[PDB]
mmCIF file of all heavy atoms in Angstrom:
data_model
loop_
_atom_site.group_PDB
_atom_site.id
_atom_site.type_symbol
_atom_site.label_atom_id
_atom_site.label_comp_id
_atom_site.label_asym_id
_atom_site.label_seq_id
_atom_site.Cartn_x
_atom_site.Cartn_y
_atom_site.Cartn_z
ATOM 1 N N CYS C 913 4.420 -39.190 -31.398
ATOM 2 C CA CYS C 913 3.388 -38.176 -31.500
ATOM 3 C C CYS C 913 2.920 -38.019 -32.949
ATOM 4 O O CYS C 913 1.728 -38.025 -33.250
ATOM 5 C CB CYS C 913 3.908 -36.824 -30.986
ATOM 6 S SG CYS C 913 4.359 -36.804 -29.254
ATOM 7 N N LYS C 914 3.872 -37.865 -33.850
ATOM 8 C CA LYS C 914 3.532 -37.635 -35.248
ATOM 9 C C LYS C 914 2.801 -38.809 -35.858
ATOM 10 O O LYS C 914 1.855 -38.622 -36.631
ATOM 11 C CB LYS C 914 4.776 -37.321 -36.054
ATOM 12 C CG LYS C 914 5.246 -35.947 -35.752
ATOM 13 C CD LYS C 914 6.589 -35.674 -36.321
ATOM 14 C CE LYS C 914 7.134 -34.429 -35.687
ATOM 15 N N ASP C 915 3.211 -40.019 -35.501
ATOM 16 C CA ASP C 915 2.647 -41.227 -36.092
ATOM 17 C C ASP C 915 1.289 -41.589 -35.525
ATOM 18 O O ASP C 915 0.666 -42.539 -35.989
ATOM 19 C CB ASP C 915 3.611 -42.403 -35.920
ATOM 20 C CG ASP C 915 4.754 -42.371 -36.903
ATOM 21 O OD1 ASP C 915 4.706 -41.556 -37.848
ATOM 22 O OD2 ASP C 915 5.695 -43.166 -36.705
ATOM 23 N N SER C 916 0.823 -40.844 -34.522
ATOM 24 C CA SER C 916 -0.457 -41.108 -33.884
ATOM 25 C C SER C 916 -1.619 -40.374 -34.530
ATOM 26 O O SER C 916 -2.768 -40.597 -34.137
ATOM 27 C CB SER C 916 -0.422 -40.719 -32.414
ATOM 28 O OG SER C 916 -0.451 -39.309 -32.242
ATOM 29 N N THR C 917 -1.341 -39.496 -35.490
ATOM 30 C CA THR C 917 -2.326 -38.560 -35.980
ATOM 31 C C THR C 917 -2.053 -38.232 -37.432
ATOM 32 O O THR C 917 -0.927 -38.362 -37.906
ATOM 33 C CB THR C 917 -2.301 -37.265 -35.117
ATOM 34 O OG1 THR C 917 -3.287 -36.352 -35.563
ATOM 35 C CG2 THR C 917 -0.968 -36.555 -35.146
ATOM 36 N N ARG C 918 -3.078 -37.744 -38.129
ATOM 37 C CA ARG C 918 -2.925 -37.195 -39.468
ATOM 38 C C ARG C 918 -2.649 -35.708 -39.457
ATOM 39 O O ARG C 918 -2.281 -35.147 -40.479
ATOM 40 C CB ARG C 918 -4.178 -37.458 -40.284
ATOM 41 C CG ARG C 918 -4.415 -38.946 -40.476
ATOM 42 C CD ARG C 918 -5.698 -39.244 -41.211
ATOM 43 N NE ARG C 918 -5.649 -38.754 -42.581
ATOM 44 C CZ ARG C 918 -6.544 -39.044 -43.505
ATOM 45 N NH1 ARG C 918 -7.549 -39.853 -43.222
ATOM 46 N NH2 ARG C 918 -6.424 -38.524 -44.716
ATOM 47 N N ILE C 919 -2.814 -35.065 -38.315
ATOM 48 C CA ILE C 919 -2.549 -33.645 -38.219
ATOM 49 C C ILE C 919 -1.061 -33.372 -38.315
ATOM 50 O O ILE C 919 -0.249 -34.146 -37.819
ATOM 51 C CB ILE C 919 -3.114 -33.109 -36.884
ATOM 52 C CG1 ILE C 919 -4.609 -33.400 -36.787
ATOM 53 C CG2 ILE C 919 -2.794 -31.625 -36.687
ATOM 54 C CD1 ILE C 919 -5.404 -32.744 -37.800
ATOM 55 N N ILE C 921 2.133 -31.929 -37.132
ATOM 56 C CA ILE C 921 2.668 -31.528 -35.835
ATOM 57 C C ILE C 921 3.846 -30.596 -36.054
ATOM 58 O O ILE C 921 4.694 -30.869 -36.889
ATOM 59 C CB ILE C 921 3.101 -32.771 -35.010
ATOM 60 C CG1 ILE C 921 1.948 -33.770 -34.897
ATOM 61 C CG2 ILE C 921 3.639 -32.377 -33.639
ATOM 62 C CD1 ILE C 921 0.651 -33.188 -34.469
HETATM 63 NA NA1 NA D 828 1.134 -38.790 -38.866
#
Side-chain angles (χ1 to χ4, degrees), chain C residues 913 915-919 921:
Chain C
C913 297
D915 282 350
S916 74
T917 182
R918 297 177 65 170
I919 303 297
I921 306 311

